[PDB]
Each structure stands twice: as structure tokens, then as C-alpha cells.
Amino acid sequence: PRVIHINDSLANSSFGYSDNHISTTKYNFATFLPKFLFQEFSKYANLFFLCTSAIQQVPHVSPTNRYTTIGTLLVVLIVSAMKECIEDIKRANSDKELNNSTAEIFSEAHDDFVEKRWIDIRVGDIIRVKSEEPIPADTIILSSSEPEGLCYIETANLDGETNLKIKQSRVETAKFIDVKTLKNMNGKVVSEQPNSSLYTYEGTMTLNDRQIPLSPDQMILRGATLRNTAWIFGLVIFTGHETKLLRNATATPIKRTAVEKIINRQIIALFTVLIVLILISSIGNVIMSTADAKHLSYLYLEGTNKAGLFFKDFLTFWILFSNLVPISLFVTVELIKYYQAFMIGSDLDLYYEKTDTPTVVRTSSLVEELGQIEYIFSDKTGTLTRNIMEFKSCSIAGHCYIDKIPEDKTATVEDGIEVGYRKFDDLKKKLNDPSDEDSPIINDFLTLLATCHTVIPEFQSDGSIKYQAASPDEGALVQGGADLGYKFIIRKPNSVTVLLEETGEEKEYQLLNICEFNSTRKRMSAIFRFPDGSIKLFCKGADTVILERLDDEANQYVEATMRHLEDYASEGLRTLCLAMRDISEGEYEEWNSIYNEAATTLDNRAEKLDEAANLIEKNLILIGATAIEDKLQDGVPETIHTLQEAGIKIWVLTGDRQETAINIGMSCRLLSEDMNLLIINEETRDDTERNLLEKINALNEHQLSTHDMNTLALVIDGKSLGFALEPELEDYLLTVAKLCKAVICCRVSPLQKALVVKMVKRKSSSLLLAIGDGANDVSMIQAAHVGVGISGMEGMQAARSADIAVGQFKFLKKLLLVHGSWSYQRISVAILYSFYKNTALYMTQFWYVFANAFSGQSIMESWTMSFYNLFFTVWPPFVIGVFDQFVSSRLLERYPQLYKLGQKGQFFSVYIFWGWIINGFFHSAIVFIGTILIYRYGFALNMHGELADHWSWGVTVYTTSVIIVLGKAALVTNQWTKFTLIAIPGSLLFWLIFFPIYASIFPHANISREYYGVVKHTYGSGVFWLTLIVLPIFALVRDFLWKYYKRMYEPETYHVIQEMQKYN
Amino acid sequence: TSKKPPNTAFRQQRLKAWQPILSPQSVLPLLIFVACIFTPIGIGLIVSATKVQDLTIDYSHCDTKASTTAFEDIPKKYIKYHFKSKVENKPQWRLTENENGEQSCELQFEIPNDIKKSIFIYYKITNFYQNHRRYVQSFDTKQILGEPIKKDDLDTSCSPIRSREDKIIYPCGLIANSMFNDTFSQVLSGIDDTEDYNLTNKHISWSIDRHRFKTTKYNASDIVPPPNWMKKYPDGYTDENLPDIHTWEEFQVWMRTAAFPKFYKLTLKNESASLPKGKYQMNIELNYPISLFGGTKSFVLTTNGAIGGRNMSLGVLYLIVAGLCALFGIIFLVKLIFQPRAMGDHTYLN
């Protein structure tokens, strides 16, 4: 029970209801850490390094400084925190921009409407909602500008239905139009508790005289949109998170890609090899310390506690090898994906001009999947078509008239009945003079085009009249019937006015009664009275419903109309038949009495009103038919062919029937003239089973040839699909669909559009891409792996819930071929290399336990190793993962088969991860043996017989390691821009300049006392600048020669495409 | 208002770049150039490492296998030498003892070639893990600067040798306690009409070590010697027994932890004159037993070169790289000459 006042802002506030502020932020300045730390430590690498840093705080165990890992941990943590804060601020910007809108609210003291913000809106205040504006909150209607009190709401955001719902006000309280009379009304509203049910409402409103009940018939939700109403007086009841729609808010589940799982497997492999190395080192340490207890007497070992000395030794290696799992990668990968999403959502070739809407990648975690898509579950109305109707053709009296007559059949052969294409000029030349017999029929048709509809006219200052219809087909019919002379103008209640431009005078007909449209009958009737005293009933309908109730002896153009419907349905044009009948006064009064008897029974409206209207629809005189087209977007017949040529299977979910869908698919270049159609249109489930069995056995009984497997398509209707989705028959459908190259689902139910997707991903390993528009298929977009939303006339409900928002369809040819094959080849190399540069360094920490008696001595400094992952090897990854292009976009679209290289997974796998790992091992061993062969006794200097030591050798090891890492990076890259020169030689010079300054300044502050005098013995030594030249070449000659060999004598596809790009 | 992205070379990914191609005409000249520039460097480095003249004598076990009454020969297993000429007389050795068991090993060798370069003399230790983690970090750096650190403020890294009998051990650490203490002759005593050859003992450590190793400000009644120095400093420290780590340069040379268990340590040098040919003799006061670490002490007399001293690792590395380059530059050449690729066309591999 929720008691709400009517005009008391302070009386209802004592209950303490929610505020109208809608917050979508993830974090806040109050409880940021208690959740951010949990989110950051819920992963693997972060918790592992936290445990490592916690272990590193015990005495005499850390082989390096106590703060050499927690520093990098805090650095990556604050980087993640600042990125989360940036994205949360970017969300809160739009949140506050939407939450501070204006609202006209009644004032108790001012006794008038004042402008305020949505934040200060309280429950119980009277507001005045204008037109073409969203609903502020859950308000009950008090009054409106209409005399009865009705209004039109659209559920384009709360539901998927595009029709307008008529919400009527209470007749006992809709008399308060002025504001000054709003002060003498008192009472309370007892509403229900906040729930999530949409069309269920109950309450009780107390008026000045008597109480009234409540119902969802006078309740408007927040997600609706008011239309065709000047102003309404509303009383808020639910606000904030207490509404019916925003209470059970949906949460988009995090989509995990395949690259993520491969990264997880590689991390598990690295953890296993880490444990192996640690255990080997510990066993060697204990056996050497036990077998040589006499030759190591100068170390003063424990002895009686040697067992414990085992455990304290274990940790000693853990930390020493904890750098094998790089923590910088888990942030570098997401930063690279963010930069890639930014660079993709800012391309001109993916920008729409006629609407000013660029590509908006709403989820930057799914950028690499665009290079490995196999299924595309597309829509037709909106995604393939322009979703704008246009009156194309009309056929009356057995003739045909079109504006653009094609030269294919313009010359009427007159093979008996007249068949062909004519212009509207001949229609006018046969209509102007009344000597023709069909002229009254043409007049009746042209009046039916501008009278039988239910479109609302609006006049403007420019003179161009606008038409507002609940459906675009009726608006297109009105526009096609008005442009020749019979325009539809101001429509007053209970009559229709038509302006005749041929004569110059305006006529008016008395609209007696109209019947609403039905989904089963697919008809609509409307009775009119003319100034001539004749009563004429018009009726519009489908081609297979009204034609059954005709008079074959009266009309002589039945077969002509059937042919005009058949040849129009063969091109995908929506056809509508129009008929008329003259009635007398007695049957008119009888039909009025039947309509009154049907209106008195408010319990039955779907069947009672239809049977009342059909009581007189026993015979009709057919006037003719109209055909409206819906063209396809520009570039779709090319993008679909290019995607099919790249090896992608398309499932078009069409709302038409079999032949219409087949024709629009053949026009869309989806199918062909020789593509074997496996038609499956059956109502009996057993017959569908038999058809599937016949298909699968006729397919498996013989081998699949190259020309036979590439030329197969499937077509299935709605009921057959609903029967083929059961758990007992889904396998047959899946195995018969995995063979055909194009699937066409006809008469698809809205919700079923999701079941076709959630059935594939649960029984396959391919990646799915669902592109669509409007709300009716939003559940599809949230079901596949990559969701794409088109910005169209069905509302922005799909673009706000899709992972990518694209203006039209044509852009896919560049979104997947170029912005996918790159987005998969970059990040992969940006990850494998991220495992190499690490292994090429800290593996020298393992080859050294054979020289320090298995003690765990750091070969390099404690802070230089920590700076290796932060300053000197952080830019080549970004350059190869954001700015590298292995093949030009000019040749990546000419040869779409390159997409298959990313579609299978030929660039990122464990078999290549192990190759990178063993290459790192090889280079580490090379540098280690090369450095120990030169610093044999440390006697490798020429400065007055002074000898080198531990750190003067670790510095050379580190320098050679970073030089070889940068050489590998330079060998990997394909695009030599300027960021590459900033990343590789830039980092080389950065290290070469940063080492002397650091080692000369910081030792004097008790930070790195192991660098005293090492600068002289390193730089001034004549062997440093010789090993730095002789070791990297010796280690990279293998990679150089192998690259040359694989390019020259064992090439691939792109290895030849790059040669063609270079030389041509 | 406008949401159209800019049209620039960066935002449209149209930056000018370079495509590295690996054509044979661009690879084979690179390989032959690398070979032609690495062969002279390699031969020059091996020639520079060849001209080093050195000598090494394993004087370990001299207290067991060396005579006492006369100079007997040293087994060929122990001696090593590289000179520009042939040595006529094999190095010999003898043992001697004074009072309180002060043993000494007297080695006698022959330098047959006038060494114009500056002479250096090291002691080589084997199987001594100075790079041990417990051993490399066990020394207080504040006492090296010379400060009176109290007991409760000493570095806990030198734990096993810290505060003996409730007195602050002044040289805390395992590196100082395990110091090599075999005194050398500091002069090559010439024999048979051969003049002596004095050797300098200072300026052998690092400059930063001489700058940081400061004379201690400790007293003598609050510090005790390390347990291994009690033989040379009995009854504790006094006003005169208290050393100075600033002038004690051998201490600074030993405190430089090496990287491998086979390391040199500079002891003596002479850069002011040439070492003429003749018979020389060196005395070593045997005090450091090899049973402490199971290694082999050695007396090394070397010179210096551009690389270091008798080490051909760099030269053989340069020669190996040049050889690999010159081998592949012929393999790939004959492979492309005798059988070309004949696969430049695309042939629709898709």
C-alpha cells in the first residue's frame, strides 16, 4: 500500500520515498576502494603478486629490495583506477546531462506552473506534460486538452510494439483544465507497491465527492512517449528506482572472448613451468648444501635447522622467479583494445553523413573478435531495407500504371487481357474525360486512397502538409494518392475532406463508422456518405482474404488483378487490395444496430467487433490493388557478396513468406540462379521430421563436390522453425544448416529471433555476429557474441544496447575485413611478444643458480629489473598492437579470403606461445654464456689492472638483453612509421641516457648503492661496446635467416600479397 | 555539435611508412658486408689476445708436496705460462718455516722475454662462492664509512658474526671475516746476477672504494675482532692494533664481491719500468688453508691488453658470426642460382 497526496509536497515527503535522480555510475568518491580493490584482486595475476609481495616481507628471504614488486603493483593499480574513473566520468557526464532536464510542475504557493529540474521532482506534485517529450515518471492522468480525456502513448522504449496505445482519463475528474481550479481538489491515491509487472495496476483515488478505482488503462509508464496530445496533467506516484520499468533493470553479461581463454591457458602453462623451475632449484640447493657441508664452512650455515632452511629457501626462489608472470600485460592489453576501439570509432568510411552518426564501439573488450566471425544473424526490415515505404504501383480496372516504365515489358503485347506497364499520364488522359467507363471506378479508387485511411494531417507555415500515421504503409498510400491531385487535408471528426487539384474545389464526405484492423482478418472497412446521397463502404485487405467474397458475375477484371498481384509479389512489393460496395439505408441501420450491440459488450472486442463488421461483408465489388516497395540500402548487394566470398554464412531472418523472401534474397545477391533451395515449409511436426531426414540422407548418401557444397541454401518458415528447435529435432536442423551457405527464415516470430541464436552458440564453437535495428530484436543483440545496432526509424533502443553502433549495413565490408583482420593480427602479436621480452631477461635468473651454488643471487639490480617492465619495454607493444598493419587496406578488401587466416586462428595459439617461450629461452642462454665467457675471472678491463665484479657484469647482461629484445621487436614490425622509431630506437637511447644519470645521482640517496663506480668500468671499458655489438647479431641471425627463408622459399598467401603491395 | 571525425594522416591511419622487404639482392650484400667487417675485427682481437704474456703457479699443497732442503721442480700439472719465447728452466719451489710455525712457500721462475708492458700480480681462488646470496649482502655499509654504530643498530644482514661476548664486532660481515690472508713478497727477488723488481701495493682498489672506506671512529674497548682475525689481533683491539680500512687496500680489494667462483684479486703491480729477462723468486706466507673451501690458490703474474689478458672469446665470437654469414651467403646464393623460386605469381592460393 502506497498512499500519495494530490497537492501537498510536504505531507507525502514524511514517508521518505526515493528521489527522481537516476544514477548509472559504477564507482563514487565514497566507497571507491572497498569495491575497486575486490574487483582488482578477484583476478589471478593481481592476487598472485599480492601474495608474492606479502611473502617478500619476511627477513632474509627477499633476493631483492622489499619494495621492488609492490611498487609495480601500485603503479598498475592506479593506472587501472584512473582508467575506471575516466570511463565512469564519461558515463556520469551523459547521466547528468539526461538527469537535469526541464519539467513544468504546479506550485502550491504560486498556484501556477513553474519550470524546475527533474532532480527536484517529488512524488505527489502536479506536472503538465507537453507533446513529443518522454514521460518523466509513473504519473496518473488528471486531465488533458482533449474533451474526452484520451491520449496516445508509444512503447518504443519499454516494449517492442510500435502501435500507439490509447489511454483515456477518468470522466469524473477530467474537467480541470485551468490551473486556478486545481487548488480546490483534495484526496489521496492508494497505489500498489513498486514491482516490475508492466500491464498490471491497481489503486483507489479519492475525489471531492466519491472515490474511484484505478487500472492500467489510465496509467502511463516512464518508458512510453506521448504523441498526438497537446498537454496532460499528471500526478507522480513512482519515481527513481521505484517505477515499474526501471526497477528490474537488466545487466549486460560480460562477454568472454576466445583470446581471453587462450591467455588463461598460457598463464596456467607459465605457472606450471614456474613451479617446475622453483622445485628444481630448491632440490638442487638442498642436495648441494647437504652434500658439501664441509667445503662451505665460511658461510656459517644453520645445520640442526637445515630442514627449515629448505622452506626459507623455497620462497627465496619464488620471488626470484615471480617476474615470469608479467602483470603489465593485463593492463597493456586493455589499453591497446581501448586505443583500437578509439581509432575504429573515428573513421570516415564508417561515418554516416545523412544522419550525423559515427561508429560508436560501446564495448572495447570485443574488438579482436571482428577478425574471426563465422555466422551473421541479420535482419531484413531496417538492416537490409531503408524502412521507408513508397507508393510504387497501382492496378485498377484491369490495367497497370507506374511512373518508371522499364524497357523490359513496356510494349503491351495484348495477349488477350491487357498485360504490361503504363504511365500515370495515360491514366490522367483517360480520367479527365468522362467518356470512359472506368472513370467512376478510378474516382472511387482515388478517393479511397485519401479517405479510407486513418492518418492525421498537420499544416505548417511553409505550406507542405505533414501526415502522421501509425504505420508507414498507410502514409505511403496517402502520399501516392495525393501527389496526382486528390490530396488529404484538414480532417474534422466524423468526416473526411479531400482537396481536388484537378478541379480546384474541396469535397467532404461523412465518415459514418470505421472498423479497426485485425491481425487475423487482415482487413479494414469504413463506411462513408457522399453529398450525392449514396452510402458507400470501402474495404482494404490482403490478396488472399477479401478476394474470396467477390461477385464473379459483376467484375470482369478478376484474372487481371490476380496476375497484377502475382507479378508484384515476385519482386517483394507489399500488395493491398481495395474494394467498395453501395449500400442502402435499411442495411445501414441494421449494421449500425449490430455495431451498437457489439459496443455494448465491452468484454469481447477482438471477436465481437470483427464479427459485427463481417456481418455485412458478405459481398464486395473489387476496385483494385496497390503495391508499395521498400528499397535496399546502398551497397548491401555488394557487401553481402563480399562477406560470402570471404567465407561467412548468413542467416537472414525475414518476416515475409517463402516466395517473397526468396525473391528479395535473390535481388540482394545472397542466393543465385543455381542455388539449390532446400525448402522446408510444413505444419505437421512429423512431416518436418521426415523432410529433415530426407534432406540429411540425400546429402550424406553421396560425396560433397567442390561445386556442390558451395551451392546450397536453406529456407524454413516460422512454424517449421518452431518445431525444429525442440531438443529432439535441433540436431537435424543444425547438421543440415551447417552445410548450406545461406539460410532464410520466413515468418519469424519476434522472440524466436533469439532462440535461433542461443541454439547455435550452445552447440558450436564459432563466433556469432547479430546485427539488427529496433527493439523487437534487442534480445538477439544481447545473445550473440558481437552485437551491432543500426540507427533507424524504429527508435534508438537497439543502438543503446549493442556492442557496436553502426549507421548502416554497407560499412560491415570494412568493419570486419579491415578492422578485424588487423584487430586480430595486432593484439595477438602484442601478447606473444609480451611473453617473450620477459623470458629473454629473467631466465638469466635461472641459468645463474648453477654458478652461485644454488643460492638465488640476483644477477641484476633490484630496481633496474623493476624498471624493465615500466620504462624501456612498454612502447613497442603499443606500436605493434595499435599502429601496425600487416597488409594494406587497399588489398585487404580486394582479396577477402585473407579473413579466413583470422577466422581459423592462425595467429594466436599455444603452439606458437611455446615457440616464443623457447626462443626466449634460447636467447637467454646465448646472452648468459656469451657474458660468462668474457667476464671469466672479471679480468676483462684495461684500466690499470682493475677488475670488474658482479654488478659491472649484470649491467652488461641487462643491456644486451634489452638490445636483443628491441632487435626482435624491429624484426617483427611491418609498418615503419614514426611511432616505431620512437618506440624501439627511442627506448634504446632512453636506456642509454637514463642509466648513467641514475647510477650517478641516486646512489648518493641510499637507493641503489650497488652502482658506485660501475659507470666508469662499464662505459669506459673497451669490451662493453664490443660485446654489445657481437652478441645481439649472434642471437638474431637465426631469426633473420629463418624469416628470409620462410618469405623466399616457403611463402604463404599474405607473404605474396605483401610482395605485390611492395612492387605494385 | 558536429560528430564528424577529422580527416588527417593520423586519425585515418594513413601515415607514411616504409615496408621492409627481404629480397635476396638486399640480403646477400648485407651478409657479405657483415662478414667483411667482422673478419678483420675478429683477427685483430685474437692478435691482441695472443700478445699477452702471463704465468700462473698453483702454490696450493706447497706445505705437503714441496721439499725443504733444496729447490725441487714443480709438477707440470700446476704451472702454466705463455711467453714470446721458450722457457729453458722449469719453475721450482721450496718450503721454509720460521718461529711458531710460520710456513712460507718460495717459488722460483724464469722470465725469458723482456716484458715492456706493466706487470700485475693477482691471487686466483677457485670454488669460492662469493656470489652466494647469504654471503654477498653480509656486511654493514655504515661501519665502512667509519661510524660508531651501537649494538642494537647494527645491520642484521651480518647476523652470524654480530656482537660477540656482548661487544660490537667492528668488521661485521662474512666478507671481512673470511679474508684471504696470504702475504706476498712485494718484490721479485732476482737470482744470479739479476736485479730485484719492486712492486707497488697501493692504488690497486677502486677509487670509489678508497673514497667510501673511511678510517673508523670507533674506540678500542668497545669492539672485538672477528673470530677469524683473533690470531693476528690477540687479546682484542688496542689503540695501536686498531686498523684503518682507508689505507688497508687489500681489505677494499677483497670486499669487492666477484661474480663467479673462479676469480682474480689484484695484489701487486708495477707500471714504471720493464721487467728484464732472468730468474726471479717470490715468497708467499702460507696462512690461508685450502681446506676451508676445497679450492686451489694460485699466484698469477700477467699483463694487460685491449680486451683483458689471454682470452679469445670475443675473437672467436666475431669469427663465428662472420663464418655463419659467409656460409649462408653462399648457401642461399647457390640455392637461388641452381633453382629459383618460380612462385612470384599469386596463382590464386586463396
Ligand SMILES: CCCCC/C=C/C/C=C\C/C=C\C/C=C\CCCC(=O)O[C@H](COC(=O)CCCCCCCCCCCCCCCCC)COP(=O)(O)O[C@@H]1[C@H](O)[C@@H](O)[C@H](OP(=O)(O)O)[C@@H](O)[C@H]1O
Ligand atoms: C656454438 C654453437 C652455435 C650454434 C648456433 C645455432 C643456431 C641455430 C640453432 C637452432 C636453430 C635450428 C634450426 C634453424 C632453422 C629453422 C628454425 C625453425 C624455427 C621455427 O620454425 O619455429 C619458430 C621458433 O623458433 C625457435 O623457437 C628457435 C628454437 C631454438 C631453441 C633451441 C633449443 C633450446 C636451446 C637452449 C640451450 C640452453 C643450453 C643450456 C646452456 C646454459 C646452461 C647454464 C617459430 O617462431 P617464429 O618467430 O620464427 O614465427 C614466425 C616468424 O614470426 C616470422 O618469420 C614468420 O613470418 P615470415 O617468415 O613470413 O616473415 C611467421 O609466419 C612465423 O611463423
Ligand SMILES: *[C@@H]1O[C@H](CO)[C@@H](O[C@@H]2O[C@H](CO)[C@@H](O[C@@H]3O[C@H](CO)[C@@H](O)[C@H](O[C@@H]4O[C@H](CO)[C@@H](O)[C@H](O)[C@@H]4O)[C@@H]3O)[C@H](O)[C@H]2NC(C)=O)[C@H](O)[C@H]1NC(C)=O
Ligand atoms: C688467516 O685466515 C685463516 C682462515 O680465516 C685463519 O685460520 C683460522 O683462524 C681462526 C682464528 O684462530 C681459527 O679459529 C679458532 O680455532 C681454534 C682451534 O684451532 C679454536 O680453539 C678457536 O676457538 C676459541 O674459542 C675460545 C672459547 O670459545 C675463545 O676464547 C677463543 O678466542 C677462540 O675463539 C677458534 O675457533 C680457525 O680454526 C682457523 N682455521 C680455519 C680453517 O678457519 C688464520 O688464523 C688467519 N691467519 C692470520 C695470521 O690472520
Ligand SMILES: *[C@@H]1O[C@H](CO)[C@@H](O[C@@H]2O[C@H](CO)[C@@H](O)[C@H](O)[C@H]2NC(C)=O)[C@H](O)[C@H]1NC(C)=O
Ligand atoms: C717498478 O719497478 C721498477 C724496476 O725495479 C722500480 O724502479 C726501481 O726502483 C728502485 C727503488 O728502490 C731503484 O733503486 C731502482 O734503481 C729502480 N730501477 C731503475 C731501473 O731505475 C720502480 O720503483 C717500481 N715501481 C714502484 C715500486 O712503484
Ligand SMILES: *[C@@H]1O[C@H](CO)[C@@H](O[C@@H]2O[C@H](CO)[C@@H](O)[C@H](O)[C@H]2NC(C)=O)[C@H](O)[C@H]1NC(C)=O
Ligand atoms: C726496492 O727493493 C729493495 C730490494 O729488496 C728493497 O730493499 C729492502 O727493503 C726491505 C724493507 O725494509 C729490507 O728489509 C731489505 O733488507 C732491503 N733489501 C735491500 C737489498 O736493500 C727496497 O725497500 C725496495 N723499495 C721500497 C720503496 O720498498
Ligand SMILES: *[C@@H]1O[C@H](CO)[C@@H](O)[C@H](O)[C@H]1NC(C)=O
Ligand atoms: C669512546 O670513548 C668512551 C669509551 O671508551 C665512550 O664514552 C665514547 O662514546 C666512545 N666513542 C667516542 C666516539 O668517543
Ligand SMILES: [Mg+2]
Ligand atoms: Mg528491423
